[PDB]
């Protein structure tokens, strides 16, 4: 299988991870902390010690089934791209929105996607589009969170993953 990876920050990673996990074409989704100022941060550091990390989901997808563009469209369905350092009531830089790449060529793909998303928003988008500086997997307790805690906190409308993308069934 030909896979590609993209890093998405769209608030509490529990909901974002569960969201991408149910999408056909997504191989894996790992919750972690990205683009912060410290190394090997724990959930506590990120949540309270202002390390600068963003709760992020490392999404690995089948490059033969989905394009990066497709993954970004799924992303925009459940994240508010206009709120700075907060997704609803989850406030702080750890909840900032952004897309982090490992390949400089993807920068333009993300920029264009954001540009098109802006077309339908009255408010200016604040989603970050920058290189993945650093990424650290979150504690295993946080992996597959909603799958283990079927009632746990979920700020994402998970069923939106079920709807097909333009030109797909």
UniProtKB/Swiss-Prot annotation:
Active site: 12
Superkingdom field: Bacteria
Region Peptide methionine sulfoxide reductase A, residue ranges: 4-159
Comment on protein domains: Possesses 2 methionine sulfoxide reductase domains (A/MsrA and B/MsrB) and 1 N-terminal thioredoxin domain.
Its job: Has an important function as a repair enzyme for proteins that have been inactivated by oxidation. Catalyzes the reversible oxidation-reduction of methionine sulfoxide in proteins to methionine.
Additional remarks: The domain MsrB is stereospecific for the R isomer of the sulfoxide of MetSO whereas the domain MsrA is stereospecific for the S isomer.
Family in the record: In the N-terminal section; belongs to the thioredoxin family.
Protein name: Peptide methionine sulfoxide reductase MsrA/MsrB
Gene encoding the protein: msrAB
């Amino acid at each position: 299988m030909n896979t590609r990876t993209i890093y998405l920050a769209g608030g509490c990673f529990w909901g974002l991870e569960a969201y991408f996990q149910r999408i056909d074409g997504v191989v894996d989704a790992v919750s972690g902390y990205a683009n912060g100022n410290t190394k090997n941060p724990s959930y506590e550091d990120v949540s309270y010690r202002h390390t600068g990390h963003a709760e992020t989901v490392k999404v690995t997808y089948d490059a033969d089934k989905l394009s990066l563009d497709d993954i970004l469209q799924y992303f925009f369905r459940v994240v508010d791209p206009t709120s700075l350092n907060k997704q609803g009531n989850d406030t702080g830089t750890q909840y900032r929105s952004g897309v982090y790449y490992t390949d400089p060529a993807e920068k333009a793909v993300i920029a264009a996607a954001l540009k098109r998303e802006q077309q339908k928003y009255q408010l200016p988008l604040v989603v970050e589009n920058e290189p993945l500086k650093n990424f650290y997997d979150a504690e295993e307790y946080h992996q597959d969170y909603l799958i283990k805690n079927p009632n746990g906190y979920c700020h994402i409308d998970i069923r939106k993953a079920d709807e097909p993308l333009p030109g797909k069934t």
